[PDB]
Amino acid sequence: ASVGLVDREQLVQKARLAEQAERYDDMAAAMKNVTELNEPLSNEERNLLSVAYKNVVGARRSSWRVISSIEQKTSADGNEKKIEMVRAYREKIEKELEAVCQDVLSLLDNYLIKNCSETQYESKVFYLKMKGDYYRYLAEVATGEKRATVVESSEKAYSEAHEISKEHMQPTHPIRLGLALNYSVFYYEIQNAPEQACHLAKTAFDDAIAELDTLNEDSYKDSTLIMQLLRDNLTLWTSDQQD
């Protein structure tokens, strides 16, 4: 034997291992395999997938940002050889980043979301938020008509997740808060619409505070963590209003 070890429990176990080894590429590949068996994912399994791909794409976002920024001070100095080199390397990272994004998005469209029964609202929301996140990540690096298309695709997923979460999930649920958090960020960073960003973040925070009275001590730690971030963002976004 030698890691041609393929049955479902084994794969999830490899994913867990890989995660502790911080080998997210391996982790993503395992969870992709689990997903492709076409059965639903447990809560733990969902998060393993989410975590793998978030880390994989996140390394490339982080790289992309450092190089995009170097490209902007560099172009001001006007050196052809360097301007080309940087451009090319930024592109190289872009293509990696997009490939990962399709990989996930394909799993979402063709396995995870598809196989949600009408009343599995929690899963459908998780997966739609995820879909919005990854189309958002594409938007960070897109330009022109390509950008416009994926921005639309992000809005549709984040919007549908919002409707579903508003009706069938309570305002303190970590997933509904996380959605509000990321959807608010989508508004601020991609749509460049600060007033919506803030409204959404504020509304979702206030709605959570209302029900905060009677939260279990288990879920209380989970929700407040996310509610902090909502607030931190809001504070940041309203500490540079019209001055």
């Binding site: 880390n55 971030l229 963002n233 940041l236």
Partner: peptide
């Protein structure tokens, strides 16, 4: 500076 999206580790 930026805003923070959902965390993990």
């Amino acid at each position: 500076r930026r805003a923070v999206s959902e965390l993990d580790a």
